[PDB]
């Protein structure tokens, strides 16, 4: 009868789909298509395709011990002509999904709602998501915020409580699907199956383990979340950005249970932790923000993504790319953070501006190539959320960071890693630079460089750019580009 | 009335030149001479000295506690001399301290007797390092042993036990050391000083640390001894060398301690860990042989240390030495052990035989190269148990190592460090590379190599002598060795 | 089922006083079976099943008195109204302060007095007791409840009283008495809840503890036990 079309909602608990597919009364056929063709620019990262076929085989495990007898696979360059042909197989009488807020998925489920209608096909989408639809929450005047504040502080404000997580299904029927048949999908090339599978080092895929890494959060780090979230020293951060970009985990219950937690210390004089949760939904409503953002402004040609600098003087380097993608620039916190990046698959927010920051603002290289290299190697790989972080550092719009400015390494090292620690983990090369200079080894006196064992060019890099002579290039770029603005 | 001269017994508990000066009745003035150019080669290497410095400082507090008015810090270039300025400025009858046994401290400390009992002072040794004393331990025609294992199977069979550990003294008398001055001794260059303190990270020296250190790893990780002692990806073994190099702990509390460990196992029917007792005091045995043979087969002239390399060509070639100490060789498992001899001062025992082969195996350097930077890199730099180690990776020894003969790096992976997480925390480039090479990367195909995101030659080293040519050198050399040996 | 252990959740006295959400409550158990479910702890999965169970109880006794209230034309008890009921304020006092000589029933008196609070099996026995062997008016033990209980609730006693009494066609057999061997190996079978309350009896071995009266003298005197004083 119904068909659960999964794409970004890897999970049973609030997951309303399935749960209105379930409350019918009838079968429930889950199914997952696979039509990254349909994505276009965004076919989904290296790294992103190893997570994927993890919680697949974690979902489809689940939904069995729910009822169902598998998860269906299709594979298929449109959705449409994919989820057409399952029904047909299956004598589907409906689809049901969640709907998603990209530019790419708007226009694409949009045409199938069509499509499939025009076929027969009883279809309804729902919010799994988002707090509260990006049409909800409007200035009072009624049109879409531009500034995140105002929008945040309108968001927790709003005159009702976003829904509370919904039930999994106590059980779901599907019938016989020994004819409905799945072909097996392929989300890795076998010369980096190997590879990809050290992954499993850092991260377990599965909405169980966004499950228990939510409440290894919210009874850890939590508490000490208002003075530490800047730190990547510690684990100070909840570790649910690849669950929640998945829909492993739902962002309703994440919002209920903190909000509950909040109410919980206040009651017990903890204003600390009380203060922590209130930071931490401000960084739940970011990701609110880069649905809003990209469903309210989205992008395509009069202003695409980073249109401000079209006008930019890009350093055409591939060997400076190479060299910041195998952390071998010579700035530790810099590389500490690009070789966990290649590591872990995951990194730090601030550490996330760090090592982007350096890259159009130091070795000044196509902001478009550092997009594509965190498209290949986060698991978090988010399409509005990386283009409301790289806005962010570029200066792209008004909420964003100053432009005619680079950032210290010792005002970054400071914030992000007092005692060096972090990048004597990655760098264990420093492990004996002490930690004044750990942050800017090459401002240290030959002495304590090799009282410390490091020789710089030999032992570890010596600074690719330096950075007066980046400061520099920044204004002859800039203003060339401003020259350029104003001349059209 | 009595000095108690400390040396390598920076221990208050089983300490049986203190606790026989406190139970004489007089006065008991404890003190420290730093006489290291009596030490001439095996004068105390920088990392070391960092560690006395703590140690002693340590020691003070503890001795100053128990009733004293500090530690005589005394300062020469030869103990004697120091030794009865003291005896004179703080005038006593006697002076105890208890006996070393490497080379240099036999004969030292025999002049010291008599140099002392020329003067009149009254001079007492005793035995604080071993459970048997050397000569205590022969064979049946009362011969020294020549092997391990028959010298250890007679410890273990000895008439009676290693002596019971000796309590503190109930506190100590020494009047009125206000006259006494104290030499402010120097362990550190300045320059030194800022990189000397990050190893504090890792180690904490003193009598107190080294004793919890003990009931650590006596309630963890001793009952998997048997079968995890081998494995440098763990914490599998007690990390006790330093605190049992300067004495900061009892060898006869750990005998007796463990072997009261053993009883309760073996009545619990845990035979795996009754059989890692066995195993960990049979670790503890090679310390006493280390001792046994510095003692009763004492390096001479008409034989020395590696007497049977002395017509090895050795390979001089300081920048290969270079690229050991930097642990820029190529090799992933010697990399990754070099990198944590520099960073923590210590290095698990088969990570120290992996590095040390592969510098006389591979680079084949002069043993002595290797030799001396061990000597200022470890904290358990230990004059008898290094020589003992040497000698047994070299084949100098007849229980020793093979000579001809080089380790597949696999071989050493495989049993030290299966999973490759030992190299990949040391080092994070490699992090994507799998199991499979992680230990002989020059090996994997390109596919494999760029997977993981290596580029054998600007991301990680290649192999600065492969394999096939260190074989086909060892035996052109040894083929050297041995028609130049026949020629005598 | 066990009074031996702290078996069950000891929400009753929050939940009475509505401090606690019982849709909260569903709502948690039923994600802690989903999560079981898909660890394989299957008996755990039906542990939620049977708590949910206990909070269902506590939704019938709402519905009992709202469709099926009290009246006058068929009261609580309504079969038992011509129950000749022992009238005794002796063996009432001596229910209340835990000495009738059975020691799962004394141990239950007792702990009821120190805490406000029993487990729902000692409950069923000591109320049993009550109107089995003693037989005294049910009014009389539904009083007491009412002052000595931290959770009493209105429709939740009455349905218990009901269901140990026969008055629901659910409810337990009327013409029948508990062997108290019986209460004993269900809720109590190592006798660590008697030994617990009465410590008098600790030395007195399980194979009595419930019913001392059948013991031997032998080892009555070993346990030192004199019944009587
Ligand atoms: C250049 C750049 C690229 C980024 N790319 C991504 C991406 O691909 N995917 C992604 O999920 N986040 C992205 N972020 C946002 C942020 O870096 C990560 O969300 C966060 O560091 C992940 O760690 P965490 O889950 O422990 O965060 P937490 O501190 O635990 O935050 C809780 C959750 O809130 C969300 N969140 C927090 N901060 C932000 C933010 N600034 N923007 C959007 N959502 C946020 C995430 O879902 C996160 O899991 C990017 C930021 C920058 C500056
Ligand atoms: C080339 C080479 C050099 C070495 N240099 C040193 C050195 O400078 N100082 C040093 O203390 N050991 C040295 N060793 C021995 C061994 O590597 C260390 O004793 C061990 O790694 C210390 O770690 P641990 O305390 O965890 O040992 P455990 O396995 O926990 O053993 C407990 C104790 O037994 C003793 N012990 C164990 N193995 C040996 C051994 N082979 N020889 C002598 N004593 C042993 C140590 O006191 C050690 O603390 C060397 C070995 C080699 C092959
Ligand atoms: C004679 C008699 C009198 C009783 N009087 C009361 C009373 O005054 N108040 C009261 O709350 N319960 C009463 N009960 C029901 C039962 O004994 C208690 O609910 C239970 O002992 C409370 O312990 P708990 O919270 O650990 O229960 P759990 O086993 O942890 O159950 C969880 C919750 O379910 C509810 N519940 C469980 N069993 C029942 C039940 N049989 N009927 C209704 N709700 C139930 C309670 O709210 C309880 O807190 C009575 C039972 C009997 C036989």
Same mark, same amino acid.
């Given at each position: 009868?119904?068909?659960?079309?999964?794409?970004?909602?890897?999970?049973?608990?609030?997951?309303?789909?399935?749960?209105?597919?379930?409350?019918?009364?009838?079968?429930?056929?889950?199914?997952?298509?696979?039509?990254?063709?349909?994505?276009?620019?965004?076919?989904?990262?290296?790294?992103?395709?190893?997570?994927?076929?993890?919680?697949?085989?974690?979902?489809?495990?689940?939904?069995? =011990?729910?009822?169902?007898?598998?998860?269906? $696979?299709?594979?298929?360059?449109?959705?449409?002509?994919?989820?057409?042909?399952?029904?047909?197989? $299956?004598?589907?009488?409906?689809?049901?999904?969640?709907?998603?807020?990209?530019?790419?998925?708007?226009?694409?489920?949009?045409?199938?709602?069509?499509?499939?209608?025009?076929?027969?096909?009883?279809?309804?989408?729902?919010?799994?998501?988002?707090?509260?639809?990006?049409?909800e929450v409007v200035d009072d005047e009624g049109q879409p915020f531009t500034?995140?504040?105002p929008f945040?502080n309108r968001?927790?404000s709003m005159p009702?409580?976003?829904?509370?997580?919904?039930?999994?299904? !106590?059980?779901?029927?599907?019938?016989?699907?020994?004819?409905?048949?799945?072909?097996?999908?392929?989300?890795?090339?076998? +010369?980096?199956?190997?590879?990809?599978?050290? @992954?499993?080092?850092?991260?377990?895929?599965?909405?169980?383990?966004?499950?228990?890494?939510? $409440?290894?959060?919210?009874?850890?780090?939590?508490?000490?979340?208002?003075?530490?979230? !800047?730190?990547?020293?510690?684990?100070? $951060? +909840?570790?649910?950005?690849?669950?929640?970009?998945?829909?492993?985990? +739902?962002?309703?219950?994440?919002?209920?249970?903190? =909000?509950?937690?909040?109410?919980? %210390?206040?009651?017990?004089?903890? *204003?600390?932790?009380? /203060?922590?949760?209130?930071?931490?939904?401000?960084?739940?409503? @970011?990701?609110?923000?880069?649905?809003?953002?990209?469903?309210?402004?989205?992008?395509?040609?009069?202003?695409?993504?980073?249109?401000?600098?079209?006008?930019?003087? %890009?350093?055409?380097? /591939?060997?400076?790319? !190479?060299?910041?993608?195998?952390?071998?620039?010579?700035?530790?916190?810099?590389?500490?953070?690009?070789?966990?990046?290649?590591?872990?698959?995951?990194?730090?927010?601030?550490?996330?501006?760090?090592?982007?920051?350096?890259?159009?603002?130091?070795?000044?290289?196509?902001?478009?190539?550092?997009? !594509?290299?965190?498209?290949?190697?986060?698991?978090?790989?988010?399409?509005?959320?990386?283009?409301?972080?790289?806005?962010?550092?570029?200066?792209?719009?008004?909420?964003?960071?100053?432009?005619?400015?680079?950032?210290?390494?010792?005002?970054?090292?400071?914030?992000?890693?007092? *005692?060096?620690?972090?990048?004597?983990?990655?760098?264990?090369?420093?492990?004996?630079?002490?930690?004044?200079?750990?942050? *800017?080894?090459?401002?240290?006196?030959?002495?304590?460089?090799?009282?410390?064992?490091?020789?710089?060019?030999?032992?570890?890099?010596?600074?690719?750019?330096?950075?007066?002579?980046?400061?520099?290039?920044?204004?002859?770029?800039?203003?060339?580009? %401003?020259?350029? /603005?104003?001349? +059209?």
């Open positions: 009868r119904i068909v659960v079309w999964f794409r970004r909602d890897l999970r049973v608990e609030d997951n309303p789909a399935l749960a209105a597919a379930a409350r019918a009364g009838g079968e429930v056929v889950p199914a997952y298509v696979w039509s990254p063709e349909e994505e276009g620019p965004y076919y989904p990262g290296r790294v992103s395709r190893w997570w994927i076929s993890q919680s697949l085989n974690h979902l489809d495990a689940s939904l069995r =011990r729910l009822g169902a007898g598998k998860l269906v $696979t299709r594979r298929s360059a449109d959705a449409a002509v994919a989820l057409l042909q399952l029904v047909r197989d $299956t004598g589907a009488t409906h689809v049901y999904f969640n709907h998603l807020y990209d530019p790419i998925s708007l226009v694409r489920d949009r045409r199938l709602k069509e499509m499939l209608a025009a076929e027969g096909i009883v279809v309804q989408s729902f919010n799994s998501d988002l707090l509260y639809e990006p049409w500034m995140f504040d945040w968001c927790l009702y409580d976003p829904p509370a997580p919904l039930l999994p299904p !106590k059980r779901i029927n599907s019938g016989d699907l020994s004819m409905c048949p799945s072909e097996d999908l392929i989300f890795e090339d076998e +010369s980096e199956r190997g590879s990809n599978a050290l @992954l499993a080092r850092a991260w377990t895929p599965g909405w169980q383990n966004a499950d228990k890494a939510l $409440t290894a959060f919210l009874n850890g780090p939590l508490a000490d979340y208002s003075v530490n979230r !800047k730190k990547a020293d510690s684990a100070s $951060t +909840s570790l649910l950005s690849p669950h929640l970009h998945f829909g492993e985990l +739902s962002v309703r219950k994440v919002f209920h249970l903190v =909000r509950m937690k909040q109410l919980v %210390w206040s009651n017990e004089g903890n *204003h600390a932790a009380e /203060e922590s949760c209130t930071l931490f939904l401000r960084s739940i409503g @970011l990701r609110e923000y880069s649905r809003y953002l990209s469903f309210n402004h989205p992008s395509s040609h009069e202003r695409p993504l980073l249109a401000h600098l079209r006008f930019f003087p %890009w350093v055409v380097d /591939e060997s400076y790319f !190479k060299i910041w993608r195998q952390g071998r620039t010579g700035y530790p916190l810099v590389d500490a953070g690009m070789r966990e990046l290649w590591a872990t698959g995951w990194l730090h927010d601030r550490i996330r501006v760090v090592v982007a920051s350096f890259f159009v603002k130091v070795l000044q290289l196509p902001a478009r190539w550092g997009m !594509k290299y965190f498209w290949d190697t986060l698991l978090d790989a988010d399409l509005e959320s990386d283009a409301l972080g790289w806005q962010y550092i570029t200066g792209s719009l008004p909420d964003g960071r100053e432009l005619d400015r680079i950032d210290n390494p010792q005002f970054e090292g400071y914030k992000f890693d007092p *005692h060096g620690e972090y990048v004597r983990r990655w760098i264990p090369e420093l492990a004996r630079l002490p930690t004044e200079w750990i942050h *800017h080894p090459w401002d240290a006196p030959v002495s304590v460089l090799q009282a410390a064992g490091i020789e710089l060019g030999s032992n570890y890099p010596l600074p690719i750019v330096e950075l007066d002579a980046a400061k520099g290039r920044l204004q002859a770029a800039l203003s060339e580009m %401003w020259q350029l /603005e104003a001349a +059209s």
